[PDB]
């Protein structure tokens, strides 16, 4: 009579990511600023550490502000869009090699392997 | 010749959640402790706020420690497992109404609607 119940919510992810992405737009709960060229990006260390082997290593020590070289701000903006959505959307073809290179550098496997 | 590229990573979610759940087990990046009965649960405010309408309201103000009444610790442990996985796994049938009630209270829709 002792039954065990299992259930999986296939809509949970998309909904969770969309809310995290909304928080990010407000800077809500953001505990790191990433400076890339002349731009500052507020983000959450837990999400960055989980999705990028570079950030995983970096946030075992870091403070509240970190800086990235060799990646243009608009490329990193797109890497963050993927990190907060699972998708890249209508990226211009002439930015693709730069995007792939940035995912190689950050250890973001899906992006690293687009090419 | 100007092409736009889109791509969706269907494995991103499961991988992201598993890493977040691993961080949680270490207390890594956890910025809130939730006290439930005689237990303390370390968790991340961003994930809790995104997945629970109650935590969404609560963390617009709160400090670093919050407390929940009316939910047993082992029920909340299972709510957190769902929040950090999308799934409930082999929950005993005699705990199900308590689980559903806890998701109603926390505004965790999938759990609230299990019954």
Round to whole Å and give the CA distance between A81 and B83. 22
Nearest to A90 among B6, B29, B51 (CB): B6
Return the structure tokens found at A86.
Answer: 């699972």
- Resolution, expressed in angstroms to one decimal: 2.0
Return the structure tokens found at A51.
Answer: 């999705």
The neighbouring-strand residues paired with A5 are B91
How many distinct structural domains can be found in chain B? 1
Q: Which residues contact B11 (CB under 8 A, 6 or more apart)?
A: A110
**CATH number of A48's domain:** 3.30.710.10
Q: Which of A3, A6, A7, A60 is best to mutate for the B interface (most B CBs within 10 A)?
A: A7
Report the chain B residue with the minimal C-alpha distance to residue A30: B46
Nearest to B44 among A46, A51, A92 (CB): A46
Residues on chain A touching B16 (C-beta within 8 angstroms): 13, 47, 50-51
Which domain does B57 fall in, by range?
A: 1-115
**Cβ atoms B31, A31 nearer than 8 A:** yes
Report the chain B residue with the minimal C-alpha distance to residue A3: B93
φ/ψ (deg, to 5) at A46: -65, -45
Whole-Å CA distances, A67 to A34, A37, A58, A111, B40: 6, 9, 11, 20, 35
Nearest to B51 among A16, A29, A87 (CB): A16
Q: Which helix (H) or strand (E) holds B50?
A: helix B45-51
Way the structure was solved: X-ray
């Amino acid at each position: 009579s002792r039954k065990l119940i299992s259930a999986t919510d296939i809509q949970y992810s998309g909904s969770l990511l969309n809310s995290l992405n909304e928080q990010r737009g407000h800077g809500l709960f953001c505990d790191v600023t990433v400076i890339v060229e002349d731009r500052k990006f507020r983000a959450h260390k837990n999400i960055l550490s989980a999705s990028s082997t570079y950030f995983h290593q970096l946030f075992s020590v870091a403070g509240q502000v970190v800086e990235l070289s060799f990646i243009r701000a608009e490329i990193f903006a797109e890497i963050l869009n993927y990190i907060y959505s699972s998708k890249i959307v209508r990226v211009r073809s002439d930015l693709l090699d730069e995007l792939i290179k940035s995912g190689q550098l950050l250890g973001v496997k899906f992006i690293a392997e687009l090419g």
